[PDB]
Amino acid sequence: TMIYLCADCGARNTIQAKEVIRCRECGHRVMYKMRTKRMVQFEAR
Amino acid sequence: TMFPQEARLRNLTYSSPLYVDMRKEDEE
Ligand SMILES: [Zn+2]
């Protein structure tokens, strides 16, 4: 499974598939996703 | 309690509960 990030704290929640959506050392229950690596092809125009 | 707009996206409806004192008799 992967890592997720909370809306406020941002700490690594690294939480497991099929469980409960929340955090660890805090509160609130949302979370976005770390940006991939990832060297991405971008024209300057 | 709710904290919008951190709600919304949880498709949550933003209401509060009503509480009306009902009378049946036990004083309170
Ligand atoms: Zn958090």
Curated annotation (Swiss-Prot), chain A:
The gene is rpc10. GO terms for cellular component: cytosol; nucleolus; nucleus; RNA polymerase I complex; RNA polymerase II, core complex; RNA polymerase III complex. DNA-dependent RNA polymerase catalyzes the transcription of DNA into RNA using the four ribonucleoside triphosphates as substrates. Common component of RNA polymerases I, II and III which synthesize ribosomal RNA precursors, mRNA precursors and many functional non-coding RNAs, and a small RNAs, such as 5S rRNA and tRNAs, respectively. Belongs to the archaeal Rpo12/eukaryotic RPC10 RNA polymerase subunit family. A zinc finger (C4-type) spans 6-26. The keyword rRNA-binding does not apply. GO terms for molecular function: DNA binding; DNA-directed RNA polymerase activity; zinc ion binding. Zn(2+) binds at C6, C9, C23, C26. Keywords: DNA-directed RNA polymerase, Metal-binding, Nucleus, Transcription, Zinc, Zinc-finger. The keyword Membrane does not apply. The chain holds residues 19 to 63 of 63 of the full protein. It comes from the Eukaryota. This is DNA-directed RNA polymerases I, II, and III subunit RPABC4. One of its GO terms (biological process) is transcription elongation by RNA polymerase I. It comes from Schizosaccharomyces pombe (strain 972 / ATCC 24843). Component of the RNA polymerase I (Pol I), RNA polymerase II (Pol II) and RNA polymerase III (Pol III) complexes consisting of 14, 12 and 17 subunits, respectively.
Swiss-Prot record, chain B:
Belongs to the RNA polymerase beta chain family. This is DNA-directed RNA polymerase II subunit RPB2. The chain holds residues 98 to 146 of 1210 of the full protein. Component of the RNA polymerase II (Pol II) complex consisting of 12 subunits. The binding of ribonucleoside triphosphate to the RNA polymerase II transcribing complex probably involves a two-step mechanism. The initial binding seems to occur at the entry (E) site and involves a magnesium ion coordinated by three conserved aspartate residues of the two largest RNA Pol II subunits. DNA-dependent RNA polymerase catalyzes the transcription of DNA into RNA using the four ribonucleoside triphosphates as substrates. Second largest component of RNA polymerase II which synthesizes mRNA precursors and many functional non-coding RNAs. Proposed to contribute to the polymerase catalytic activity and forms the polymerase active center together with the largest subunit. Pol II is the central component of the basal RNA polymerase II transcription machinery. It is composed of mobile elements that move relative to each other. The gene is rpb2. The lineage of its organism: Eukaryota, Fungi, Dikarya, Ascomycota, Taphrinomycotina. It is found in: Nucleus.
